[PDB]
Amino acid sequence: CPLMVKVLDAVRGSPAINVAVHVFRKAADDTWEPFASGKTSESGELHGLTTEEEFVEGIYKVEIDTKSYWKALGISPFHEHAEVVFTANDSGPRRYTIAALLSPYSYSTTAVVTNP
Amino acid sequence: CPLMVKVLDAVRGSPAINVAVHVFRKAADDTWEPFASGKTSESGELHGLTTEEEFVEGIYKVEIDTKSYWKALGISPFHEHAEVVFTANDSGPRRYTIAALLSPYSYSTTAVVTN
Amino acid sequence: CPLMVKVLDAVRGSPAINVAVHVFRKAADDTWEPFASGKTSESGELHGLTTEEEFVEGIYKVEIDTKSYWKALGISPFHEHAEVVFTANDSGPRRYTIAALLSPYSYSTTAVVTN
Amino acid sequence: CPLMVKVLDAVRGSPAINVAVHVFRKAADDTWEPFASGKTSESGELHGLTTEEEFVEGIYKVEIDTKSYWKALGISPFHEHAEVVFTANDSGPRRYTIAALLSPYSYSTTAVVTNP
Ligand SMILES: *B(O)c1ccc(/C=C/c2ccc(B(O)O)cc2Cl)c(Cl)c1
């Protein structure tokens, strides 16, 4: 698990459950290629997106589908999604946790990057 | 003046209006002495709290009554209030903006310190 | 105008000055079309991006070049940029402020939407 | 473990390690009584502050000593500490995670409240 996503809900004070997440990797032609996807569990965590072998050096985009989340709760939010774009593994393999804290008109994201 | 407070609402995407704010200065006996207070404006801002002459170096606490704000909107909040505790330092820039972004179970705060 | 962008630096406690900002509008073929751009001022603000007439309902992306900002300060950042993607809606209030608070490995963004 | 504190560093993209945390509870005379303290581990987490029996209804203040943290890293921060004040267990026993994300001139905090 070199890539994990965690999502929290700042309105309910809870994990954000059943949040869809799509990961893209920039290809040689500079387009965004689909790389992995999944949804957060009851704990707000999404594990198993990729493997150490598959998660090579590259520019990755983690799209967290916040609008679908809020609308599934009957709330009309501001943003379409939260996007997190970063270069990964440029100094060799690392483990990445992308965390996001959601409100209807605001979000924050941080990364925790560790060396295994 | 040298101290402004700005409060935003992350749920509604708006200034947080009519929020009570209290500023305290730390006394020699380590207690918190009332210093200044007011309510945020329609723009979520509270100006005119103090003056350059009165705002000396020291430790200050800005207490924002977030609980009343959320209850007035019919929303159940986690915190009793938000508190921002910091040292005023003459070495650094002269004007302090303390900004707070409010959610029912979360808040963020930053300082914008300029000349 | 109807759209302002404000960028703050959480490390130095200051406006984020001379940060490049690009605004895109989503086209019918789902691609991102350049719409407006500029660099933040000494106050961390970028005004005059668009007008009421040009800023129609639709999906917009605000891309903030955070990587260059941090590198110019000699600090190693995590993100390639910060992106804020949202729908402009005529039903809601008329003026949009997109604010971003920057750290090397984190950012926060909020929308202040007023009449 | 009805009360856990987690602290992250937004400058380094890491857990905030060795952060001192002091918890107070408001007493009948309206003063802040020392309740528990500890420091964050290598994972940025502080476990074992209290027990279900001891963690009764009350108003609690969690003081995270952010200034000592930044200064131990040779950085002069703005805030003295981050304070989190909340009523706990007013609708019966809950589990609380208090999370904080730190920068030198800014911090954010959120709560995750679960029912065991
Ligand atoms: B925490 O993640 C966080 C706190 C505050 C703010 C925003 C501050 C701000 C927004 C807008 C204006 B304005 O319209 O002139 C001024 C300020 Cl100081 C954010 Cl984004 C995040």
Pair of tokens at residue D34: 């020392």
What H or E segment, with its residue span, contains residue A70? helix A66-71
- Tokens 């987490």 identify what position? D45
Pairing of strands D106-114, A3-9: unpaired
Find residues 52-91 of chain C whose CB sits inside 8 Å of chain A.
59, 78-81, 83-87
Contact D106 B106 (CB under 8 A): no
**8 A C-beta contact, residue A99 and residue A109:** yes
**8 A C-beta contact, residue D89 and residue D3:** no
The strand pairing partners of A92, in sequence order, are: A90
Contact partners, residue B74, CB within 8 Å, separation at least 6: none
D90-109 CB burial, b ≥16 within 10 A, e <16 = eeeebebbbbbbbbbbbbbb
Domain chopping of chain B, boundaries: 1-115
* Chain D environment of C9 (Cβ under 8 Å): 105
The strand pairing partners of B4, in sequence order, are: B97
Largest CA distance in chain B: 44
Pairing of strands C58-64, C45-46: unpaired
What H or E segment, with its residue span, contains residue D108? strand D106-114
What H or E segment, with its residue span, contains residue B66? helix B66-72
In this structure, the dihedral spanned by the alpha carbons of residues B59, B77, C83 and C23, taken in order and rounded to 10 degrees, is -90
Cβ-defined contacts of A46-54 (< 8 Å, 24+): A46/A4, A46/A5, A46/A6, A46/A7, A46/A19, A46/A21, A47/A1, A47/A4, A48/A1, A49/A1, A49/A3, A49/A4, A49/A5, A49/A21, A49/A23, A50/A2, A50/A3, A50/A23, A51/A2, A52/A2, A52/A93
The residue contributing the CA closest to ligand 1 atom 10 is C99
DSSP string, A84-109: EEEEESBTB--EEEEEEEEETTEEEE
What is the gyration radius of the CA atoms in chain B, in angstroms?
A: 14
Query: Is the CB of residue C4 less than 8 Å away from at least one CB of chain B?
Result: no
C107 to chain B: closest CA residue: B108
Residue type, D34: P
Cα separation, C76 vs D5, whole angstroms = 28
Pair of tokens at residue D2: 């009805």
**8 A C-beta contact, residue D109 and residue D84:** yes
The strand pairing partners of C114, in sequence order, are: C95
Please state how this structure was obtained.
X-ray
The strand pairing partners of B52, in sequence order, are: none
DSSP string, C45-101: EE--S--TTT--SEEEEEEE-HHHHHHHTT---SEEEEEEEEEE-SSS-SEEEEEEE
- Tokens 């009165």 identify what position? B54
A70 — phi, psi (to 5°)? -65, -40
Cα separation, B114 vs A98, whole angstroms = 32
Pair of tokens at residue B111: 């300082």
Contact D106 C104 (CB under 8 A): no
Cα separation, D6 vs C105, whole angstroms = 17
DSSP D90: B
Could you give the C-alpha distances from B13 to B44, C29, C62, in angstroms and in order? 12, 30, 17
Å resolution of this model?
A: 1.5
**Ligand 1 site, residue C97, Cβ cutoff 6 A:** yes
**8 A C-beta contact, residue A66 and residue A81:** yes
- Helix segments in D20-96, DSSP class H: 66-71
